[PDB]
Every structure is written in structure tokens, then in C-alpha cells.
Enzyme design. Structure first.
Site: not given
Ligand SMILES: c1ccc2c(NC3CCCCC3)nc(C3CC3)nc2c1
Length: 305
Positions: A136, A191, A236, A253, A255, A257, A300
Site C-alpha cells: 500500500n 509494516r 503479492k 506479482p 496488484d 497497478h 512495468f
Molecule cells: C511498489 C513497488 C514496486 C512495484 C512493482 N515492482 C515490479 C514487480 C515485478 C517486476 C519488476 C518490478 N510492481 C508493481 C506491480 C506488479 C506490477 N507494483 C509495485 C509497487
């Protein structure tokens, strides 16, 4: 003492043969894999790698590395092996970029605008506690929390300008009975409990660093399940550690996003929830193949720009 640049101290830099097609520091180090790198000068990335401070920068055909330790000198060939290992420079990205590009046309389009997106091979402890700090949270605030965690509980390595670099804390440091209250004072919120209680679980119940090596040698399925016994480690965070520290390149992972990305750019919809997240994971593994987490990193990184 100041952050080095390639221009001002060329003798202190060792060069690695590394074209922009194999690595772009600017799409990797700030792009939510590691939170220990800052562009402290233009095109010059400073951070802690294997308990030493490094500055990294690249020209069209070479990666340039300096290490801050005695008297200043070039990284030794042994020290540079840490850098090769971290960027997984054995893995020829161009082969992976083509294979993904063939089986997915949107990817092919993004891939030729965003070359050199590699997946770091991160220390398991650093990766686990960094991603516990990730929930979060945006990259900016995660970076701040990890910095404050390392300041509080990791060894002081060096100061460059007004930046004091610390080693990543050990399990022993994070397992202490005062750690949770202090991490709350540093703004980690909920956390804080996760960090302290997970450090304790790993030391007292799982048998220390030996467990994360065991999870490295296990299947994705075993390692993911195993991580989800830790306070604050769900699907996640388990997927993040699997992909970025436990050599499970099929980990994806998911989320909200990764979801706005699949909705818009892939015309996907759930047939955001545990069930819908797992479906999305399965899709990208089916589509991109055994290195699907690596392909996800390209999209990403691309999307952050
Ligand atoms: C905060 C910090 C890092 C990430 C993050 N990092 C990605 C993880 C998988 C590949 C490389 C880096 N990914 C994501 C979403 C899955 C796309 N949200 C975040 C939110």
C-alpha cells in the site's frame, strides 16, 4: 567525500562490456525492484551492493562501476563479479526480448522503446524486508522507509556528500524486542510488526539464512507457499521475493497497478480479488512462458516512464 562521476575520476572506474540493449540502469534501478539506488548525479546511480557502496553509469557499449571502500582504486575483478551476479549479465536479454516479442505483439511494440530492462538477482533478506515495506505504498515512500530501516538497524558504511549509506540490517538486528516500536516511530506503521515478527520467525522457527537458500533450491510452488507463513507476506509479496531473490522467473506479482495495465493494454477482465489476481498471473505465465516475471518487468518499467 563526494559521489564520483566517470568524467572527474576515470582511473577509479572498471568497465564491463554491456550494450544499452542488455541493460538500461535508468529503467532498472529506480523501477521498483531495488529501493537502494538513487541517481545522485545525472546518469550516475549510487547504492549499496554486497555491504559496499557503488556508483554505476554507462556509455553506449559499456557499464562503468566504482566502489567506495584504505586508498581509492578501481573495483577488483572479484568485486565486479558481485555486479555481474546482481544484473544477471550471463542471461542474454536479446534472446528473451525476441521470444516475448514473437508470442505477444503489444510487448514487441513496448520492447523496441524500452531495451535493457533486466531483473536484478537480489539478496533474499534485503528483498524480503524491502517488499514487506512495499505494501500500500509508492516507490518514493518505500525508498524512504527502507532508507530509515537501514539507518536505524544496519551498519554505517560511509558518507558521500550528505548521504550516509548503511548495510541492510541482519535478521539478528530486525528480531530485537524494541524493533517494532522504533520502526513505528520511523513511519512504517503496520509494516513495523511484520518486519520484527518475520525476522523472529526466520531466526527462531525456520533456521536463519539456510531457509532462504532452501527456498532458492525449491519449486516456485513450494517457495511461494513457504513465504506465506511469514507475518505480512501474502501472494503479492511472496511473488515479488520469488521473482527478484529466489530465482523463480515465472513468478508474476499482481496488484491493482498490474491490472489497469492488463485492462487497458490487453482487453482483460475478471471472469480486483485473490481469485481474479491468480487468473491474471496464470494468463501471463501461459502467454510469456517460463520467464513471465522478466517480461512483466519490461511493461512495468515502460509504464513508469
Ligand atoms: C511498489 C513497488 C514496486 C512495484 C512493482 N515492482 C515490479 C514487480 C515485478 C517486476 C519488476 C518490478 N510492481 C508493481 C506491480 C506488479 C506490477 N507494483 C509495485 C509497487
Amino acid at each position: 567525500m563526494g559521489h564520483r562521476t566517470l568524467a572527474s575520476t576515470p582511473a577509479l572506474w572498471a568497465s564491463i562490456p554491456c550494450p544499452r540493449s542488455e541493460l538500461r540502469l535508468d529503467l532498472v534501478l529506480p523501477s521498483g525492484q531495488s529501493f537502494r539506488w538513487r541517481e545522485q548525479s545525472p546518469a550516475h546511480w549510487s547504492g549499496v551492493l554486497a555491504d559496499q557502496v557503488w556508483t554505476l553509469t554507462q556509455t553506449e557499449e559499456q557499464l562503468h562501476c566504482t566502489v567506495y571502500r584504505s586508498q581509492a582504486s578501481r573495483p577488483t575483478p572479484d568485486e565486479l563479479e558481485a555486479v555481474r551476479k546482481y544484473f544477471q549479465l550471463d542471461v542474454t536479454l536479446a534472446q528473451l526480448y525476441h521470444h516475448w516479442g514473437s508470442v505477444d505483439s503489444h510487448f514487441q511494440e513496448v520492447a523496441q522503446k524500452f531495451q535493457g530492462v533486466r531483473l536484478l538477482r537480489q539478496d533474499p533478506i534485503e528483498c524480503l524486508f524491502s517488499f514487506i515495506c512495499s505494501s500500500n505504498n509508492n516507490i518514493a515512500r518505500i525508498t524512504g522507509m527502507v532508507e530509515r530501516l537501514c539507518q536505524a538497524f544496519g551498519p554505517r558504511l560511509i558518507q558521500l556528500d550528505d548521504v550516509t549509506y548503511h548495510g541492510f540490517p541482519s535478521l539478528q538486528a530486525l528480531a530485537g524486542p524494541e524493533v517494532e516500536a522504533h520502526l513505528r516511530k520511523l513511519g512504517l506503521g503496520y509494516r513495523a510488526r511484520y518486519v520484527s515478527a518475520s525476522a523472529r520467525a526466520i531466526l527462531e522457527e525456520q533456521g536463519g539464512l539456510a531457509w532462504l537458500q532452501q527456498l532458492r533450491e525449491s519449486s516456485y510452488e513450494e517457495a511461494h507457499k513457504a513465504l506465506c507463513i511469514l507475518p505480512g507476506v501474502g501472494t503479492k509479496v511472496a511473488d515479488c521475493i520469488c521473482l527478484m531473490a529466489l530465482d523463480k522467473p515465472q513468478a508474476v506479482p499482481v496488484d491493482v497497478h498490474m491490472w489497469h495495465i492488463a485492462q487497458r493494454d490487453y482487453s482483460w477482465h475478471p471472469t480486483p480479488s485473490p481469485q481474479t489476481n491468480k487468473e491474471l498471473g496464470n494468463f501471463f505465465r501461459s502467454l510469456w512462458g517460463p520467464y513471465a516475471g522478466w517480461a512483466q518487468a519490461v511493461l512495468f518499467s515502460a509504464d513508469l516512464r
